[PDB]
Each structure stands twice: as structure tokens, then as C-alpha cells.
Amino acid sequence: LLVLAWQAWQSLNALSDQAAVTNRSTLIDARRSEAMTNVALEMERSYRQYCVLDDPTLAKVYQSQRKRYSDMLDAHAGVLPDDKLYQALRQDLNALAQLQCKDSGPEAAAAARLEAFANANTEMVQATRTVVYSRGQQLQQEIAERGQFFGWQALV
Amino acid sequence: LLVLAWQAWQSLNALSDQAAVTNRSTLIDARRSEAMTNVALEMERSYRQYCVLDDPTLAKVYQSQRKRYSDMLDAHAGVLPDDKLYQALRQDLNALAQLQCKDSGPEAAAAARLEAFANANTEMVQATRTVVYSRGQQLQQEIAERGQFFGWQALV
Amino acid sequence: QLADYLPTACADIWSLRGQAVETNPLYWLRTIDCADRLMPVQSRAEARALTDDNWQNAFRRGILLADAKITPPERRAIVTRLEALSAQIPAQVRPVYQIWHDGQALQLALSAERQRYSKLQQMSDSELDALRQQQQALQTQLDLTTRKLESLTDIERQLSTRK
Amino acid sequence: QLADYLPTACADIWSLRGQAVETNPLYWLRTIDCADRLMPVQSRAEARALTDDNWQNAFRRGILLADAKITPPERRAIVTRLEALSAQIPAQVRPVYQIWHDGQALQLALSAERQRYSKLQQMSDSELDALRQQQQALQTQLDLTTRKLESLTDIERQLSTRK
């Protein structure tokens, strides 16, 4: 019957497109989150080193790193369902735009917000990993539903 | 006949299992490669800082990082199709065990070796990401071809 | 044939003048041995009534004010002045004049030596103070740099152990 | 009344020996004149053979070897020797003894002051050398530390540029 051929075509198209886009998006999201955490750690290190060792070149390097992190954060908003957490990360990053500390170490509130920034970035990478696993499991469940439909059609 | 439908159902379930395991393995491979490159960068930083400062505590930190990278390398042998470059990384990492240097800087042979090690680690991450595309595209192509073959060859 | 006046008091011998007596040194020795035992303020009081236009009066003024504790500007002035005294002097008093001149010479030489010693001591103290303060500044600079190094290494260790 | 011998003839003042001129000071003014006006080497040569225990002989020996750049130790020794023998000084001869002792003792004081000044200068130079070498050591420590800091910053820059 024509129904079998039509459903085969739809299955091919849907499964192929979903498999390709899910693989690519998951890989991009994982790599982006890992680079996010790494540049956050580098951000903290550059901040501390500039505060201990006063030098405008360290400030320029920190500016470049902050711009890179802001760009990379702007390309990850559409994946995490809760926009509040992404906006909080953006606000913390923009709060870390200035380098100010009186003593050798950073400002006390600066230290607290840096620790909050690190914890939030760790939670961000965890949430991105969970969403990636969710997308993979969703592909698995959809293809399982297709298999169940095939089994129901097997009754004839 | 119903035997064809049963075979299609079983093949689809096996394909679902394959898709899930491929997704999980690919994600863990990407994460492992990124952590590999980050640990290599931290290795370089720790080596240079210990050579400049001559602090046994930095040496112990470098030993811990080297052990972590050795584990990570041991947990990645079975993915890369070729073995020469992986064995080269293993040998380079093992030989980068002692910290021998003069006048606040690694000796010239050690410096060139470290550079080459960084380039080879970049080649590792590139090759494993190529294998990632290979596995994803293999799953995509094989599911598409199986679907099209079953749809076209069962039109009667 | 020269008489002796040593046993008698030195006041009248110091008071008397005349060319007849001036040809004998013995009364000059009497005056010099009386002047030191005299009260320096009383010596100044008795020498104030003297003048400097003649060699004898300037000579005895030098004796009277030499033993007194005086600042060496006027001592230098009088030892530069007594060349006029040397311009007119009989041979009898030349030896004692020479001895007095040597005495004043080593006096002012000792004063100049002690002033040179004080100047060198103060110069050495000043240079020592300057070198000590420079050392303190450089030590503070080393403390600052070693604190910076220690803090930087500590932040590196903390970030390493965060992982 | 004392006989006058104003001309100075040192060739026979040893021969007179002072047995009859002990009351006339001009004898020892002649002695000091002929001592300081003559070449001291002949004075030392003649004083070598003179008596030492006799008070007048020791006195004249002291005058005749008082010059020719003699070392301060034996100088203080000999003036103390005359002070030990200062019990035989005649009253008429007392003032010249007093002035001679004052001159000699002040010469010893000047020499001691010179020695003290030289000693203070040499301690000052030693302390300056010690402080200079300590400053050099601390300066090389500081430049080593700042070199380490510069190297650390340079490796940070290099690794940042690596990415």
C-alpha cells in the first residue's frame, strides 16, 4: 500500500534531520560549555594576577578575555530553558568589567561575586550537559515511539 | 509479510540502542578531549612556573597534574583509529616527568619537546573531533539507507 | 751682673717698665710663672689697662690672655700680630720669645687638629646616616617585591587546588 | 746679682756642668736655644754619652733629644722620668722647667689626638665598607627578585598569547 511508502519517506526525512541536528547541536553545546568554564577560570586568574601585580597589559588581556566570554555567552542563551540564570551570568560578567582592589587581594564583595560566578558557571555547564542528555534521550524515545508504531502496524 | 514487520521492529529497536550509546560515547569523548587540552595547558603553565620559582610544592602540583593527564590518556586509547600519535603522546608525557631546567627556563630540547607536545595534543583533539563527526555521520547515513531500503524494497 | 727679682711678689715686677730692666729675661720668667697662677678674669682685668702699640705691652698681654680659656680666632690674630713685636726685640728676650711662639704654635695646631677631627667625625656620621636610610629604603623595596611574589604564588596555588 | 753671659756658646755648656750656674736661669735658656737652633743629630750623639741618673744630666739629655722626630711612647716615658726627678728642681729654675714640661706634655697630647683621629677615621672607613658591601648584597637580592617577577609576568603573557 502507498501508506507504507509514505510513512517510510516521512520516517527517513524526520529521523535523518533529527539525528544530524541533534548530534551537531549537542556537540556544539558541550564544547561551548567546556570552553566557557575554562575561560571563566582564566578570567579569575587574570583578575587575581592583575590585582596582585599592577600592570595595564594584564588589564588589556582581561578585557580581551571578557569580550571573548561575552561573545561566547551570547551564543548560548537559546539552549537553556531558564533565561533567568543566563541573564544572571551576563549581569555578573558585566559586573566583573571593572578591576578595583585596594589591598593585594581583590575587593571583598569582588571575591564573593567571583566565587558566585564560578559556582554559577559550574551549574551552567552541568545544566548544559543535562539538556544535551535530554535531547539525546528525546531522540531515543521518539525512535522508540516509531518502533512501537511499526509493531502496532505489524498486526495488520 | 509479518516476518518482515517483526524484523523491521527488531532492527529499529537495535538502531535506537545504537543511537543512544553512540550519543553518550561521543559526548564523553568530546568532554575528555577538551579536558585533555586544558590539562596540557595547565601542564605548560606549571612547568614554567616551577622552573622560574624552584618550589617543591609546584613540583608536587605538577606531579598530580601529570598523573591526571596520564589517566585521561589511558582512558582514550580505544577511540582513535591510529596508534602512532597516541603512543607518541604517551611517550612524551612519560618523558616529561622530571623537571630539569636552568636560569629560569626549560632547556632548549625540553622547550622544543614541550612545544611539539602542545601541537600533538591539538592534533589529538582535532582527530578525535573528526572521529566524532565520523560516528555521527555514520549513524545518520546508515539509518537513512536502512529506512530507504526497507521502504523501497517492501512496496509490494 | 743681673739682679734677681723672683723671690719678691710678681705684682710690682708686672707693674714696672723701663729699658734698664727690659734687658734682663729673669723678670720675664717671673711674669710667665706668675701669670698662670693668676686668676684669668683678674688677668683680663689687669690686661685691659694695657695697649698694643708697643712690643712689650703686647707681649705681656699675650702672656696674660694665653693661659685663659679663649677662642682661637683672637689667638690666631695675636700670633699673626706678634711679627710686629719680632720687628723690634733685643737679643736677650729672643729665646723666651721663641719658646712662647712655639708654645702658641702647638696650641693653635692642636686646636686646628681637634676641629678637623670634629669635622671628620660629623661628616662620617652624616654619610653613615645617608647610607643607612638608603639601605632602609632598598630593604623596604625588597620586602614589597617579595610580598608580591609570595602573593602571586599563593593565588596560583589556590586556583590550582580549586580544581 | 747674677753674672751675664748673653752670647750663646753651646760648645762649653756641658763643660760648665752647672755647679756654679745653678742659680742663673740664662744658662738653661742658652741650652734650649743651642738645642733648638742646632742640627739634632749632633745633640743626640752628644746626649748618648751623657749621664742619666743625675737630675741635671737627665734634664739636659731631655732637652737635647727632645727633637728629631722621636716616638711618643718614650716621650711620655722620659717626661714622666723628669717628673720622678722633679724633686731636685731649684726655685729659680722652676719656671723654665714648668714651661718646658707644659710644651712637651702638650706635644704628647697633640700626638695622641692625631692617633685618635686616625683611629676614628679608620673605623669610619671600615664601617663604610661594611655598609657598602651589605647594600650591594641587598641590591643584588632585589634585582634577582625583580627578575623573577618579570619572568613570571612574561610567561603569563606568552601563555595568554598562545591561545
The answer to the question of residue A25 being in a domain is no
Report how far residue D45's alpha carbon sits from residue D107's, in angstroms, rounded to the nearest whole number. 23
Q: How many domains does chain A have?
A: 1
Report how far residue C26's alpha carbon sits from residue D95's, in angstroms, rounded to the nearest whole number. 10
Neighbour count for residue C19 (Cβ, 10 Å): 8
Q: Rounded to the nearest 10 degrees, what angle do helices C55-66 and C72-87 cross at? A: 150
Q: What is the resolution of this structure in A?
A: 3.9
Decide if A104 and C147 are in contact by the 8 Å CB cutoff. yes
Q: Rounded to the nearest 10 degrees, what angle do helices C94-162 and A2-52 cross at? A: 170
C2, β-bridge pairs: D2
The answer to the question of residue B21 being in a domain is no
CA angle A57, A58, A61 (to 5 degrees): 90
The answer to the question of residue B142 being in a domain is yes
Report how far residue C18's alpha carbon sits from residue B112's, in angstroms, rounded to the nearest whole number. 111
C-alpha grid cell, residue B147:
529506512
The amino acid that residue A154 corresponds to is: A
Report how far residue D129's alpha carbon sits from residue D123's, in angstroms, rounded to the nearest whole number. 10
Give me the phi and psi of D2, to 5 degrees please: -125, 140
Contact D101, D82 (CB under 8 A): yes
Please enumerate in sequence order all residues whose Cβ is within 8 A of that of C100, keeping only pairs 6 or more positions apart, or say none.
C32, C62, C63, C66
Tally of residues, chain C: 163
Nearest-Cα residue of chain B relative to residue D148: B52
C-alpha grid cell, residue B116:
611539539
DSSP A44-112: HHHHHHHHHS--HHHHHHHHHHHHHHHHHHHTSTTTSS-HHHHHHHHHHHHHTTS---SSSS--HHHHH
Tally of residues, chain A: 156
Contact C44, C74 (CB under 8 A): no
Terminal alpha carbon distance of chain D: 119
Report how far residue B113's alpha carbon sits from residue C89's, in angstroms, rounded to the nearest whole number. 103
Chain D hits for C145, CB-CB cut-off 8 Å, are: 142, 145-146, 149
Q: Rounded to the nearest 10 degrees, what angle do helices D94-162 and C94-162 cross at? A: 20
Q: What one-character DSSP code corresponds to residue C38?
A: S
Decide if A147 and B26 are in contact by the 8 Å CB cutoff. no
C-alpha grid cell, residue A73:
555567552
DSSP C72-119: HHHHHHHHHHHHHHHHS--TTTHHHHHHHHHHHHHHHHHHHHHHHHHH
Decide if D152 and B41 are in contact by the 8 Å CB cutoff. no
* Residue whose C-alpha cell reads 686668676 in the numeric block: C39
CA angle A95, A97, A101 (to 5 degrees): 90
Decide if A53 and D153 are in contact by the 8 Å CB cutoff. yes
Q: Which of A146, A132, A128, A142 is nearest to A23 (CA)?
A: A132
Domain ranges of chain C: 10-114
Report how far residue A19's alpha carbon sits from residue B150's, in angstroms, rounded to the nearest whole number. 19
The helix/strand/coil state of B106 is: strand
Whether chain A has a CB inside 8 Å of the CB on B138: the answer is no
Q: Which of A49, A42, A22 is nearest to A117 (CA)?
A: A42
Contact C95, D33 (CB under 8 A): yes
Nearest-Cα residue of chain C relative to residue B45: C156
Neighbour count for residue A132 (Cβ, 10 Å): 23
Report how far residue A92's alpha carbon sits from residue A116's, in angstroms, rounded to the nearest whole number. 9
The answer to the question of residue B54 being in a domain is yes
Contact B118, B71 (CB under 8 A): no
* Residue whose C-alpha cell reads 680666632 in the numeric block: C73
Whether chain D has a CB inside 8 Å of the CB on C92: the answer is yes
| C133-155 burial code (b ≥16 CB/10 A, e <16) | eebeeeeeebeebeebbebbbeb
Contact C145, D146 (CB under 8 A): yes
Contact D86, D98 (CB under 8 A): no
C-alpha grid cell, residue D102:
707644659
> SS in 3 state form for chain D?
CECCCCCCCCCCHHHHCCCCCCCCCHHHHHHHHHHHCCCHHHHHHHHHCCCCCCHHHHHHHHHHCCCCCCCHHHHHHHHHHHHHCHHHCCCCCHHHHHHHHHHHHHHHHHHHHHHHHHHHHHHHHHHHHHHHHHHHHHHHHHHHHHHHHHHHHHHHHHHHHHC
Percent of residues in chain B assigned helix, strand, coil, to nearest 5:
85, 0, 15
Contact D25, D2 (CB under 8 A): no
B101, β-bridge pairs: B106
Q: Which of D151, D156, D158 to mutate against chain B (most B CBs within 10 Å)?
A: D151
Chain D hits for B49, CB-CB cut-off 8 Å, are: 152, 155
Decide if B49 and C156 are in contact by the 8 Å CB cutoff. yes
Neighbour count for residue D127 (Cβ, 10 Å): 14
Terminal alpha carbon distance of chain C: 119
Chain A hits for D153, CB-CB cut-off 8 Å, are: 53, 55, 58
Please enumerate in sequence order all residues whose Cβ is within 8 A of that of D66, keeping only pairs 6 or more positions apart, or say none.
D35, D104
The amino acid that residue A58 corresponds to is: L
Backbone conformation region of residue B124, classed left if phi is above 0, alpha if psi is from -120 to 50, else beta: alpha
Chains with ≥3 Cβ pairs under 8 A against D? A, B, C
C-alpha grid cell, residue D80:
714622666
Structural element, H or E, at residue B14: helix B2-53
Report how far residue C75's alpha carbon sits from residue A137's, in angstroms, rounded to the nearest whole number. 115
C-alpha grid cell, residue D42:
749632633
Report how far residue B79's alpha carbon sits from residue B92's, in angstroms, rounded to the nearest whole number. 19
Contact A127, A80 (CB under 8 A): yes
Contact A29, B29 (CB under 8 A): no
**Method used to determine the 3D structure:** cryo-EM
Report how far residue A131's alpha carbon sits from residue A137's, in angstroms, rounded to the nearest whole number. 10
**CA A33 from centre of chain:** 4
Q: Which of B58, C153, B61 is nearest to A48 (CA)?
A: C153
Q: Which of residues 104-163 of C touch A (CB under 8 A)?
A: 147-148, 151-152, 155-156, 159, 162
Contact A124, A85 (CB under 8 A): yes
Report how far residue C107's alpha carbon sits from residue D106's, in angstroms, rounded to the nearest whole number. 8
Give me the phi and psi of A143, to 5 degrees please: -70, -30
For residue A119, the enclosing domain spans: 33-129
**CA D75 from centre of chain:** 9
Structural element, H or E, at residue A43: helix A2-52
Report how far residue D44's alpha carbon sits from residue B104's, in angstroms, rounded to the nearest whole number. 75
